[PDB]
Design an enzyme around this catalytic site. Sequence first.
Site, PDB file in Angstrom:
ATOM      1  N   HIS A 148     -27.894 -21.498 -10.702  1.00  0.00           N
ATOM      2  CA  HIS A 148     -27.737 -21.799 -12.122  1.00  0.00           C
ATOM      3  C   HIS A 148     -28.725 -22.868 -12.575  1.00  0.00           C
ATOM      4  CE1 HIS A 148     -25.653 -23.468 -15.734  1.00  0.00           C
ATOM      5  NE2 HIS A 148     -25.403 -22.188 -15.942  1.00  0.00           N
ATOM      6  N   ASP A 205     -27.352 -30.273 -13.411  1.00  0.00           N
ATOM      7  CA  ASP A 205     -26.811 -28.950 -13.127  1.00  0.00           C
ATOM      8  C   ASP A 205     -26.470 -28.801 -11.647  1.00  0.00           C
ATOM      9  OD1 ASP A 205     -26.713 -25.838 -13.089  1.00  0.00           O
ATOM     10  OD2 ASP A 205     -27.118 -26.312 -15.197  1.00  0.00           O
TER      11      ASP A 205
END
Length: 279
Positions: free
Chosen positions: A69, A39
């Site tokens: 995130h 990510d």
Amino acid sequence: AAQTNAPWGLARISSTSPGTSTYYYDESAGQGSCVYVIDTGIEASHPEFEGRAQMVKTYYYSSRDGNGHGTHCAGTVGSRTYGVAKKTQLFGVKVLDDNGSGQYSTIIAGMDFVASDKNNRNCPKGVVASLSLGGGYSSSVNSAAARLQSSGVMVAVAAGNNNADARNYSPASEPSVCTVGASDRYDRRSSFSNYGSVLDIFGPGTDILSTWIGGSTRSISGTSMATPHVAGLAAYLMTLGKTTAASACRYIADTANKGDLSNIPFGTVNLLAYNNYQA
């Protein structure tokens, strides 16, 4: 073990009805397993990770999560308050920039890194990879995800957030990985969640409270939130020994809550991730 006043998604994982708030789980809590969060990075310094998170690879100048995130996604995997597997080891692979955007070369290289790095990590209970990302259909991205799965890693990928058939998305359309849709607290498929025959399981995805950068918390929605629920569940069940990386996606689907979600179109599985808590 039991966590009262847990996030609704955690309570949903251990319950057979919507609207409970206590998450029940075996004390092993995924200890001995590892989850690679591919990510924007992980804020390893967040006290909710209790030192169980570390950055192992970045394709940018910094390994820090300058977006949030990836920290949110890793929190749902194995943070103390917001994680499914509260004792697992988290590894950060930064393939998305601080804007949350990725690249074809970096995302493909990132899956190759996990398969090569897992050897030298202490993961006696198995290795999991959580991919809260996605793009248009690409046989190359699908092949890279299948190769990561064949290396001995349980790969969980997000279905997408366009209320569309995930067959036209990669790596969501790769059959050999575990494609995850999102549900809301009322057991309805999230308004945004992708669907289709390529979906394997649904997870909590709407208004998911988890960790955020700056040692904080935040509630957000997306199949990016549902995927770490399933990745954490796989690491939890692999530590329990009831499945391994090769069989985890089918085992989760075989033991899931069946037919309890609403607005599931024909052709899409009606299966919600469930830990089948044996007290």
